[PDB]
Design a protein around this ligand. Structure first.
Ligand SMILES: COc1cc(N2CCN(C)CC2)ccc1/N=C1/N=CC(Cl)C(Nc2cccc3c2C(=O)N(C)C3)=N1
Length: 256
């Protein structure tokens, strides 16, 4: 996975992760060429300690291969250390949904939910627990394609009650988080529990309260969300079940 630095043309800064800035760029391999890529940079990889955990995040992504998860292209392991990722040209999902609120059809929103469910069913089949499903971690590759962002790049308001209370994390706790992510998508990138203190979230959940039906959301889809938010994790659908139900909701919408 090692790439020669001279095969990367560093371009405009697009975002920023924990370790440092993220740039867009061009990767020239004798196989494409001129491939658009994202370049993750690291502040102070002069420090050898932060380089090891920075590069460990690339290894994380190496194990996955799915159309709706961003792909690792390679790494440049000498200073400055770079991780080369697939570029999702349209950027962060939340911003995308906010700017395009009155331009995106419902069919598109449901499509994004469905695509994410395929990625998450894949992760569930790999026995991989994500722990951080939220619209903030989704990228837009095309107007008809979203992808789970880099897993390297507490979220109480997204978390299942058993995660908040007892730090239990399972694929069923991921399902709860995905329910919240679906709500965010159908709300056009509004965050859940606005104006609510983190410490107050579990009290609301335990009171039976739930995020309300988004304006214009099909009741079948809202019903699906509420199934993700069963208090008892064993009562929540698996991601493969969500995928199947989202397929039908999408097909019905495409129809009207
Ligand atoms: C032009 O492509 C873009 C553009 C942006 N922005 C454009 C300029 N905005 C002012 C800020 C954000 C943000 C992201 C982006 N595309 C990618 N494509 C791939 C990857 Cl890995 C990536 N990385 C992120 C870049 C920024 C935020 C996040 C990223 C991420 O992976 N997560 C989970 C959050 N971003």
């Amino acid at each position: 996975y090692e790439i020669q630095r001279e095969r990367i043309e560093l371009g405009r800064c697009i975002g920023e992760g924990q370790f440092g800035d993220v740039h867009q760029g061009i990767y020239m391999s004798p196989e494409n060429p001129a491939m658009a890529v994202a370049i993750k940079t690291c502040k102070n990889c002069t420090s050898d300690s932060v380089r090891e955990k920075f590069l460990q995040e690339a290894l994380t992504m190496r194990q996955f291969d799915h159309p709706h998860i961003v792909k690792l292209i390679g790494v440049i392991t000498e200073n400055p250390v770079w991780i080369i990722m697939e570029l999702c040209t349209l950027g962060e999902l939340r911003s995308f949904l906010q700017v395009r609120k009155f331009s995106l059809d419902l069919a598109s929103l449901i499509l994004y939910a469905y695509q994410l469910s395929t990625a998450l069913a894949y992760l569930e089949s790999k026995r991989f627990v994500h722990r951080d499903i939220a619209a903030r971690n989704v990228l837009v590759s095309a107007t008809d394609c979203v992808k789970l962002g880099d897993f390297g790049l507490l979220p109480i308001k997204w978390m299942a009650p058993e995660s908040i209370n007892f730090r239990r994390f399972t694929s069923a706790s991921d399902v709860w988080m995905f329910g919240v992510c679906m709500w965010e998508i159908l709300m056009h990138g509004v965050k859940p529990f606005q104006g609510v203190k983190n410490n107050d979230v579990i009290g609301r959940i335990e009171n039976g309260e739930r995020l309300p039906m988004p304006p214009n959301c099909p009741p079948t889809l809202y019903s699906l969300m509420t199934k993700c938010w069963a208090y008892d994790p064993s009562r929540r659908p698996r991601f493969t079940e969500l995928k199947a139900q989202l397929s039908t909701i999408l097909e019905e919408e495409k129809l009207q």
